[PDB]
């Protein structure tokens, strides 16, 4: 997976170059500006789950306006980014991470919210590809299983530093649990699995999807050609196919079913050996989801998918 890890490093170190570009943003009024941008660049993403589709275009334009140079209403006074080169590079970073935090602390709790957040992330990525590379940067670090790559336990570094690589949320004191960590990882790739299939409707876009559905085929191929982890793999595989299996079936008619009549024969027996009966909850539901789909020859539309009824009311 050298090809993928090189591309992975590019987005990582390239986001690190962004960590260096606005270090000057790290006075009494200069602190007011930093908060005003961090504030007026993360509230809109938090309301995407709680709005009507008829109104959802308001948030898209409000993000597009603030980010394109135009002003936006934050509180009472108006905020802008024009002639604010660090504020521009600062908003793209916090915006890209807020999209991931929402997939981390909302999509984990409520799977339906992935799609209204994905379309908005997909349209902004479309108009501003730099924001999208920052979206992949944070998604990759917070969730390395979305690259995908399984970090290995290494000698010479502390254990706590290794647990963070795995994506475990740790306060300075201790590491987060595993059950709450599996939810954070699920919600993050259900969001990602929704992004690679949905497209912002309005705007009259001539070009291709920013992060197309092609990245969904390789991801499934790239995690099934490596040995599975005990509980993560069987979980993340399910909540990925449930979200993006339908869109992947239509694009690749016969090639997707060949990949699906394979996991039942080859990759499913592999998961039984590595996992004790005490934590089979991932693999057991991975089959319940298929057995229906296999005999039905169809993957249900993800529960929460956006319909036309959503865009009018």
């Amino acid at each position: 997976q050298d090809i993928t890890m090189q591309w992975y490093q590019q987005l990582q170190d390239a986001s690190m170059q962004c960590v260096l570009t606005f270090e000057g943003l790290t006075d009494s009024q200069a602190k007011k500006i930093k908060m005003d941008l961090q504030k007026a660049a993360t509230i809109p993403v938090s309301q995407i789950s709680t709005i009507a589709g008829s109104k959802l275009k308001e948030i898209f334009d409000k993000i597009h306006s603030l980010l394109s140079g135009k002003p936006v209403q934050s509180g009472g006074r108006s905020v802008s980014v024009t002639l604010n080169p660090q504020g521009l590079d600062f908003v793209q970073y916090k915006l890209a991470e807020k999209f991931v935090k929402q997939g981390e602390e909302e999509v984990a709790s409520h799977h339906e919210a992935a799609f209204p957040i994905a379309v908005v992330a997909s349209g902004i990525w479309e108009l501003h590809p730099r924001v999208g590379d920052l979206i992949l940067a944070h998604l990759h670090k917070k969730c390395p299983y979305s690259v995908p790559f399984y970090p290995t336990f290494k000698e010479g570094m502390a254990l706590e530093d290794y647990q963070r690589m795995l994506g475990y949320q740790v306060k300075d004191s201790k590491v987060e649990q595993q059950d709450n960590f599996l939810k954070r990882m699920s919600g993050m790739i259900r969001l990602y699995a929704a992004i690679i299939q949905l497209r912002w409707p309005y705007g009259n876009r001539q070009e291709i999807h920013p992060h197309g559905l092609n990245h969904g085929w390789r991801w499934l191929a790239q995690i099934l050609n490596m040995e599975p982890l005990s509980d993560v793999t069987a979980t993340l595989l399910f909540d990925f196919l449930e979200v993006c299996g339908n869109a992947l079936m239509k694009q690749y008619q016969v090639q997707f079913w060949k990949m699906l009549i394979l996991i039942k024969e080859d990759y499913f027996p592999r998961i039984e050996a590595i996992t004790s009966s005490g934590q089979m909850g991932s693999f057991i539901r991975l089959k319940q989801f298929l057995e229906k789909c296999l005999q039905h020859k169809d993957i249900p539309v993800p529960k929460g998918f956006l319909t036309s009824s959503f865009w009018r009311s």
Partner: peptide
């Protein structure tokens, strides 16, 4: 020669190990 033994089998609907 047939001997039915419902007692100890192998779950046909669960993977191994």
């Amino acid at each position: 020669k047939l001997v039915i033994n419902k007692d100890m089998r192998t779950d046909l609907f669960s993977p191994p190990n």
